[PDB]
Write a protein that binds this ligand. Structure first.
Ligand code: MG
Ligand code: MG
Ligand code: MG
Ligand code: MG
Ligand code: MG
Ligand code: MG
Ligand code: MG
Ligand code: MG
Ligand code: MG
Ligand code: MG
Ligand code: MG
Ligand code: MG
Ligand code: MG
Ligand code: MG
Ligand code: MG
Ligand code: MG
Ligand code: MG
Ligand code: MG
Ligand code: MG
Ligand code: MG
Ligand code: MG
Ligand code: MG
Ligand code: MG
Ligand code: MG
Lengths: 123, 208, 123
RNA sequence: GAGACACGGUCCAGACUCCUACGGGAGGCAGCAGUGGGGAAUAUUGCACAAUGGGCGCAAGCCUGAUGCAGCCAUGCCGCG
RNA sequence: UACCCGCAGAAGAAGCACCGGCUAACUCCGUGCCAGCAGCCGCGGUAAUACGGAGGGUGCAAGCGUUAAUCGGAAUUACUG
């Protein structure tokens, strides 16, 4: 459950701390983006010396949500906040070099194996 | 067939520099006609005394121009005593030759004009709330738009909008010549007094 | 001038500054040959004088003077500056060393070669 | 333990660098050499503890890379060419 | 190993700066307010000991010019003064 105007935290060290979602990609009249979905973001406030600066328009991937993710056995894993990892607008690869917090295996694919490897713990 | 526009200027120099400019212009024209290229005179603003020209602009039309020009472009020096002051000591007088730039002046196409019909924003009456005689001629490359609503006949409104677009683009075509003459002007103070490519000594005016 | 006055406020020493401040405690301050030109001296001299513009490592900018006869320097290059002031070239406080991170020696000089960086012409 | 709240001793937190089955672990040259970087600029990954004496022990022994010192350099200075 | 004793040969080692005045030391040939500039005063625009080369002198030398840089000369923060 991530819409436009939704405010997310940042789960890597690209330099940004808060981002705001401005588009859900991949369909017409799309409402929500879950874990593993790409979104378009803008940076709202960042550290003074980082790889990204405030006000830039860029891509991201959703990693952690409060809504949760269902599993085949019917279980559900929730978190206490919304987090995302910043990706390059053209190549869609992570900008930073370190991942904070746990992740899930909904990211286990050929596109986010780097994120999976860098994550300190995987649920 | 190449087109070159060159300027010969005295810089910020005295009547001796103006006289040198006149002589060098004459020799340049003679050498160009010998080399077989044609020309026309554009500006020949006069100096302050007799037979003293301040600056001149030349239009060059011919073939193999970049080889004829490269022995002239730069600084030309005349070595001789001043004829206006019989006891002055300065002996080297420098004048400058530069290569200028021209634009891509094109006649106005009408196929670039887009028309929009909308409602004239008055106060207003119930007939003007209907009328779509407001004609907007928008020029798609430049983005410049002008609106005409003077007459209630939409043909005349369209004609007036087209005429106003003509006029207003004829003020964007006119602020470019001034903008490039602001660039022609700098060449006057850009003359460097040294490293001469050509030297003329005495009144015999021998090349070197 | 009295002793009571001199004990209530002692003699003040004169502070003196340097005329080569961009050297910053160092006989040389590294810089890039941004742009190279010639200027004309003011009264009562007349010639062409060869100089070069240089960008300091701390974010400032200086101008240097090229001695000798014949210089082969261009832009996009890095040189040094030794010191020595030319007056009638208003604004020039440094001399280029003949061979300082870009430069060469004076071509076919034969005496006083140490100052103009000419290698030894050996029979 | 006498001793600071601690270089090569301990615990915790932090940034950085590594090994992992992912559960978890290791490290601190401002010791002597050395490497990368910065600079306008400064030496060789040398040896004998034979000596000093810190040190630790009754001592041998050894840290010893401080010391004795090397190899190198026009660096300051001195005397030599 | 410092050092002491034999071999050969001037060999295997003489160069650098300034130069009108301050300051020890200026003639010529090329050029022409161009090329060339310092510490200051200032040279070069057809006659230059102030530029280049030749040359010459002078003085130094494992060093000269420039700063980072100091003190002095500066009685120019002066108690001595
Ligand atoms: Mg008379
Ligand atoms: Mg009304
Ligand atoms: Mg109506
Ligand atoms: Mg000299
Ligand atoms: Mg104890
Ligand atoms: Mg302590
Ligand atoms: Mg301790
Ligand atoms: Mg521990
Ligand atoms: Mg250590
Ligand atoms: Mg080690
Ligand atoms: Mg070290
Ligand atoms: Mg280093
Ligand atoms: Mg370096
Ligand atoms: Mg080495
Ligand atoms: Mg020992
Ligand atoms: Mg020495
Ligand atoms: Mg002198
Ligand atoms: Mg003297
Ligand atoms: Mg000179
Ligand atoms: Mg003269
Ligand atoms: Mg002469
Ligand atoms: Mg000595
Ligand atoms: Mg002093
Ligand atoms: Mg005093």
């Amino acid at each position: 459950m991530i819409q436009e105007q939704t405010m997310l935290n940042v789960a890597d060290n690209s330099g940004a701390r808060r981002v705001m979602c401005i588009k859900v990609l991949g369909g017409s009249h799309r409402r929500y983006a879950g874990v593993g979905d790409i979104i378009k973001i803008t940076i709202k406030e960042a550290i003074p010396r980082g790889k990204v600066k405030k006000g830039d328009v860029l891509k991201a991937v959703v990693v952690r949500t409060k809504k949760g993710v269902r599993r085949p056995d019917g279980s559900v894993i929730r978190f206490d906040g919304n987090a995302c990892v910043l990706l390059n607008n053209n190549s869609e690869q992570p900008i930073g070099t370190r991942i904070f917090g746990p992740v899930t295996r909904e990211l286990r694919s050929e596109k986010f194996m780097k994120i999976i490897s860098l994550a300190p713990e995987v649920l | 067939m190449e087109e070159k526009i060159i300027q010969i200027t005295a810089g910020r120099g005295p009547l001796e520099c103006q006289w040198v400019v006149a002589k060098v212009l004459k020799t340049f024209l003679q050498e160009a006609t010998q080399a077989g290229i044609s020309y026309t005179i554009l500006s020949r603003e006069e100096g302050d005394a007799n037979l003293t020209v301040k600056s001149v602009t030349l239009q060059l039309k011919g073939k193999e121009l970049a080889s004829f020009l490269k022995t002239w472009l730069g600084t030309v020096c005349w070595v001789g005593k001043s004829t206006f002051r019989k006891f002055h000591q300065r002996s080297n007088w420098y004048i400058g030759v530069f290569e200028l730039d021209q634009l891509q002046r094109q006649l106005f196409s009408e196929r670039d004009v887009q028309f929009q019909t909308t409602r004239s924003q008055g106060n207003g009456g119930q007939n003007v709330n209907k009328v779509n005689s407001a004609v907007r001629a928008t020029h798609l490359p430049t983005g410049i738009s002008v609106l005409a609503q003077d007459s209630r006949s939409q043909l005349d409104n369209k004609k007036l909008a087209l005429a106003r677009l003509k006029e207003k683009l004829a003020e964007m075509e006119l602020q470019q010549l001034a903008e490039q003459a602001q660039n022609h002007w700098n060449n006057h103070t850009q003359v460097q007094r040294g490293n001469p490519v050509r030297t003329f000594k005495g009144t015999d005016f021998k090349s070197t | 001038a009295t002793v009571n006055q001199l004990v209530r406020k002692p003699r003040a020493r004169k502070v003196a500054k340097s005329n080569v401040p961009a050297l910053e405690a160092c006989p040389q301050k590294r810089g890039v040959c941004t742009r190279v030109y010639t200027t004309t001296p003011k009264k009562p001299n007349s010639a062409l004088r060869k100089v070069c513009r240089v960008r300091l490592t701390n974010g400032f900018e200086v101008t240097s003077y090229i001695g000798g006869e014949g210089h082969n320097l261009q832009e996009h290059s890095v040189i040094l500056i030794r010191g020595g002031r030319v007056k009638d070239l208003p604004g020039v406080r440094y001399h280029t060393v003949r061979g300082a991170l870009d430069c060469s020696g004076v071509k076919d000089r034969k005496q006083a070669r140490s100052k103009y960086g000419v290698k030894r012409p050996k029979a």
